[PDB]
Amino acid sequence: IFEPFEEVKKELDLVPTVPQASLARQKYVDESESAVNEQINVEYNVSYVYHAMFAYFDRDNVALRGLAKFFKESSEEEREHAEKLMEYQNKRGGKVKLQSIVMPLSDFDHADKGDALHAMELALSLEKLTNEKLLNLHSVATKNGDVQLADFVETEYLGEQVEAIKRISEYVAQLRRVGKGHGVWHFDQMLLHE
Amino acid sequence: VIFEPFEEVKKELDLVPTVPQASLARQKYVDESESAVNEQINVEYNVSYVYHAMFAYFDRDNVALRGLAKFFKESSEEEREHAEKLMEYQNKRGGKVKLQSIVMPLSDFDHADKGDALHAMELALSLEKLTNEKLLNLHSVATKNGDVQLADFVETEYLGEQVEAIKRISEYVAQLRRVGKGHGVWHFDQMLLHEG
Amino acid sequence: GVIFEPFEEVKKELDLVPTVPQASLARQKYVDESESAVNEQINVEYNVSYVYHAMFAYFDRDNVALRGLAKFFKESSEEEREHAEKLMEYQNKRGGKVKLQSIVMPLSDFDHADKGDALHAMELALSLEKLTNEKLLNLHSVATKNGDVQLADFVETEYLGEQVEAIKRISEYVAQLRRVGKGHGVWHFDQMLLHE
Amino acid sequence: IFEPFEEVKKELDLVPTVPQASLARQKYVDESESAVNEQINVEYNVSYVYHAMFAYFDRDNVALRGLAKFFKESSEEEREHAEKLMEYQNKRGGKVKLQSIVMPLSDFDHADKGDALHAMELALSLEKLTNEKLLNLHSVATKNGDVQLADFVETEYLGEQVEAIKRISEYVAQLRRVGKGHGVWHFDQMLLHE
Numbered sequence: 001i002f003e004p005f006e007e008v009k010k011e012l013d014l015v016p017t018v019p020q021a022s023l024a025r026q027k028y029v030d031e032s033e034s035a036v037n038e039q040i041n042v043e044y045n046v047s048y049v050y051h052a053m054f055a056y057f058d059r060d061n062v063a064l065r066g067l068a069k070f071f072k073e074s075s076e077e078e079r080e081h082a083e084k085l086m087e088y089q090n091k092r093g094g095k096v097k098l099q100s101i102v103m104p105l106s107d108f109d110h111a112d113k114g115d116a117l118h119a120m121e122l123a124l125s126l127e128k129l130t131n132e133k134l135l136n137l138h139s140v141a142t143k144n145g146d147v148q149l150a151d152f153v154e155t156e157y158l159g160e161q162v163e164a165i166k167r168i169s170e171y172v173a174q175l176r177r178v179g180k181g182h183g184v185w186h187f188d189q190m191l192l193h194e
Numbered sequence: 195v196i197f198e199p200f201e202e203v204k205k206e207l208d209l210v211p212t213v214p215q216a217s218l219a220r221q222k223y224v225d226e227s228e229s230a231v232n233e234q235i236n237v238e239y240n241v242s243y244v245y246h247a248m249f250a251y252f253d254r255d256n257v258a259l260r261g262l263a264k265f266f267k268e269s270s271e272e273e274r275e276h277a278e279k280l281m282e283y284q285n286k287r288g289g290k291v292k293l294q295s296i297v298m299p300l301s302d303f304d305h306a307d308k309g310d311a312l313h314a315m316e317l318a319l320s321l322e323k324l325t326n327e328k329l330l331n332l333h334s335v336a337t338k339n340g341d342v343q344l345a346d347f348v349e350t351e352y353l354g355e356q357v358e359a360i361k362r363i364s365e366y367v368a369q370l371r372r373v374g375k376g377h378g379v380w381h382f383d384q385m386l387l388h389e390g
Numbered sequence: 391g392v393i394f395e396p397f398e399e400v401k402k403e404l405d406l407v408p409t410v411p412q413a414s415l416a417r418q419k420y421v422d423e424s425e426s427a428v429n430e431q432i433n434v435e436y437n438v439s440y441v442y443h444a445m446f447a448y449f450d451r452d453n454v455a456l457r458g459l460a461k462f463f464k465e466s467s468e469e470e471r472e473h474a475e476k477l478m479e480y481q482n483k484r485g486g487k488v489k490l491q492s493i494v495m496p497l498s499d500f501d502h503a504d505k506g507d508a509l510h511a512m513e514l515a516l517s518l519e520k521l522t523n524e525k526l527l528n529l530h531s532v533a534t535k536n537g538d539v540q541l542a543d544f545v546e547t548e549y550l551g552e553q554v555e556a557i558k559r560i561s562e563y564v565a566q567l568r569r570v571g572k573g574h575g576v577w578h579f580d581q582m583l584l585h586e
Numbered sequence: 587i588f589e590p591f592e593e594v595k596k597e598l599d600l601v602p603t604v605p606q607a608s609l610a611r612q613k614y615v616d617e618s619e620s621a622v623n624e625q626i627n628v629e630y631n632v633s634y635v636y637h638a639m640f641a642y643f644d645r646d647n648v649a650l651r652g653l654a655k656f657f658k659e660s661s662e663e664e665r666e667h668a669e670k671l672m673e674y675q676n677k678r679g680g681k682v683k684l685q686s687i688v689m690p691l692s693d694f695d696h697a698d699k700g701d702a703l704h705a706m707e708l709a710l711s712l713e714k715l716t717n718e719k720l721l722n723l724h725s726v727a728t729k730n731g732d733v734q735l736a737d738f739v740e741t742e743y744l745g746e747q748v749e750a751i752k753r754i755s756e757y758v759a760q761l762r763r764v765g766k767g768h769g770v771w772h773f774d775q776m777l778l779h780e
């Protein structure tokens with residue numbers, strides 16, 4: 001027999017009184033809170049790197065407008081991934097802690113591979129690294145028995161990340177097939193209108 | 195790899211129940227899981243009833259907090275929906291729903307120190323946290339018993355929603371504390387009354 | 391407070407990019423056992439699609455003339471092929487290699503003197519759906535045992551809840567067929583299904 | 587010149603009474619029924635092979651999206667061809683007998699020709715094989731004097747098969763003209779948006 005007011009007597013007492021404490025926080029341990037903050041920083045870093053890549057391909061002497069557009073839009077998307085995690089942190093009553101963002105590379109030319117292929121391979125590696133970080137976040141949730149955090153990560157991030165990795169892998173493959181010069185420019189035109 | 199449907203189908207073909215009272219659908223759904231689902235149905239129905247009591251209090255002419263009355267009324271209906279979804283789930287899995295008794299709730303929600311509004315929102319927050327604990331319990335029963343789909347159902351249909359409900363009410367508690375009793379509470383209530 | 395340095399940590403991720411043309415660029419933490427298990431499930435779904443197509447072909451006979459059942463099995467076959475295709479697409483998303491396997495010859499006749507054709511076929515369909523559920527849970531188990539988080543989640547999300555609903559749907563058909571009885575009742579049930 | 591009820595009472599007593607017998611079947615001999623079941627299996631097999639082709643070209647490292655889409659659509663179309671023959675079998679009161687489907691090739695790479703050209707040449711060969719089988723089915727119908735079966739095959743299948751063969755032949759020719767690399771990728775873009 002479940003008596004709400006009997007079993008809720010204790011709960012009503014646990015309600016925080018000091019203004020700075022979260023009222024919502026429940027079964028959300030410090031390590032989980034910190035793991036979410038770490039992932040916010042990972043997504044924000046990738047956003048920043050993509051913005052650097054946009055800035056490179058937007059150069060008049062590089063003039064790959066499709067790549068510039070793709071990286072510009074990707075940068076915006078990554079910031080949204082970071083923001084979703086910041087909002088999640090607050091839903092669970094953790095405190096968002098934005099960390100420093102390191103200076104990214106500015107130049108993406110590559111003598112052998114060519115700038116386009118080099119940049120897409122870097123992007124692929126960045127998305128694979130992001131996947132590793134997400135799987136680490138998931139591992140922290142699972143270790144700490146945080147069922148809803150693990151579900152949130154699976155549902156909002158993991159499937160999406162698999163799709164992002166396949167998408168970029170396909171770009172790498174196509175850039176390898178078309179080759180430098182005319183081929184790269186044409187692939188770029190495709191991307192511009194994709 | 196190699197797979198012969200008509201050969202392997204033998205197992206389950208002669209496992210099709212023949213007595214009218216037995217579930218045809220039930221598969222890898224143990225009694226403990228069925229019982230835990232019935233327990234959660236009762237938890238949700240209970241919360242629905244408590245919110246209905248809170249509605250009835252704030253709907254009093256001398257209390258006259260129309261925003262809170264509306265919020266609790268809608269919350270009661272939503273809770274009943276949560277119970278019903280679990281009743282439907284029980285039947286999807288071939289378990290038998292067993293509705294249990296519902297206890298008489300408190301009727302008065304006044305509080306000298308906190309004021310009625312803040313007291314009731316704090317109670318609502320505590321009820322939602324208690325419900326979260328019970329939902330996570332249900333998830334634990336499923337995981338312990340190895341019921342993959344029951345665990346997935348609880349996470350997917352209930353857990354994220356419960357986190358949202360808790361933050362929502364926490365924000366109400368915070369605002370009520372900030373505005374203070376009297377004019378502030380009344381103003382907060384007006385906000386809640388017209389809240390989108 | 392620098393806790394993450396992308397260009398330092400990606401160096402490993404970069405010197406791991408395949409240069410051999412036949413190798414997947416996307417594949418990451420997706421082991422052979424998981425790839426094999428997904429290929430097995432593709433074959434399970436394709437086999438079920440084929441069986442449903444055989445059942446369609448039987449109920450579409452002029453002398454059987456149960457148009458509702460024929461329509462149901464025809465649609466079920468198409469849906470099952472979609473289940474197979476979604477797994478083929480998933481295999482490629484993860485950078486596994488799809489390997490389609492042989493499909494065995496299904497039964498062609500679904501007559502049954504005592505149960506009647508309709509009830510017999512629905513009971514068979516129920517058993518096939520329960521069998522598929524066992525197979526899906528087996529796939530989930532392979533993922534969980536190997537620690538493939540996203541594969542487990544894909545199976546839960548895209549297949550397991552759906553399978554539970556499919557099982558209840560067909561269980562209800564079996565129950566109704568048993569209630570209405572052979573002859574006029576079965577024909578009437580079939581009309582309902584034709585227009586459901 | 588013609589009295590329906592004189593000639594019909596003999597026909598009326600020929601109407602089957604046992605529930606397992608087709609009521610519709612008329613002038614449809616076992617050889618024709620068998621030949622129709624054979625063609626069902628041919629079409630279903632081609633459907634499966636096309637699905638294998640789709641699965642190959644949908645690989646991230648192959649990344650020919652136009653070819654993948656073409657083979658995916660061809661697979662669905664081929665299954666429809668099989669289903670139409672299944673429906674026809676039932677119209678004539680024959681009994682459909684689905685047969686086993688063999689494991690198809692999974693890899694379609696080719697060092698000399700390149701993957702795209704090789705796959706299109708294989709597709710052309712498959713469609714020519716299907717055409718031969720359809721013509722054989724027509725031959726069986728004619729040998730047995732089944733006028734309507736012959737007509738069904740020529741009306742519903744033979745013209746379509748000629749179109750399919752020209753279509754794929756044109757793809758082979760274009761792939762040969764554009765050459766490997768940038769050319770193949772461009773052809774694939776054309777096919778993707780065709």
Ligand SMILES: [Ca+2]
Pocket residue numbers: 043046078081130
């Ligand atoms: Ca991201």
Ligand SMILES: [Ca+2]
Pocket residue numbers: 080083
């Ligand atoms: Ca935004």
Ligand SMILES: [Ca+2]
Pocket residue numbers: 095
């Ligand atoms: Ca803290």
Ligand SMILES: [Ca+2]
Pocket residue numbers: 150151154155349543546
């Ligand atoms: Ca999940």
Ligand SMILES: [Ca+2]
Pocket residue numbers: 154155156157158159160
């Ligand atoms: Ca998702």
Ligand SMILES: [Ca+2]
Pocket residue numbers: none
């Ligand atoms: Ca795609």
Ligand SMILES: [Ca+2]
Pocket residue numbers: 238241273276325
């Ligand atoms: Ca609830």
Ligand SMILES: [Ca+2]
Pocket residue numbers: 275278
């Ligand atoms: Ca309702």
Ligand SMILES: [Ca+2]
Pocket residue numbers: 290
């Ligand atoms: Ca029982």
Ligand SMILES: [Ca+2]
Pocket residue numbers: 151345346349
């Ligand atoms: Ca889970």
Ligand SMILES: [Ca+2]
Pocket residue numbers: 349350351352353354355
């Ligand atoms: Ca949810």
Ligand SMILES: [Ca+2]
Pocket residue numbers: none
């Ligand atoms: Ca909000």
Ligand SMILES: [Ca+2]
Pocket residue numbers: 435438470473522
């Ligand atoms: Ca299925």
Ligand SMILES: [Ca+2]
Pocket residue numbers: 472475
């Ligand atoms: Ca499809």
Ligand SMILES: [Ca+2]
Pocket residue numbers: 487
């Ligand atoms: Ca391999």
Ligand SMILES: [Ca+2]
Pocket residue numbers: 546547548549550551552
């Ligand atoms: Ca689902």
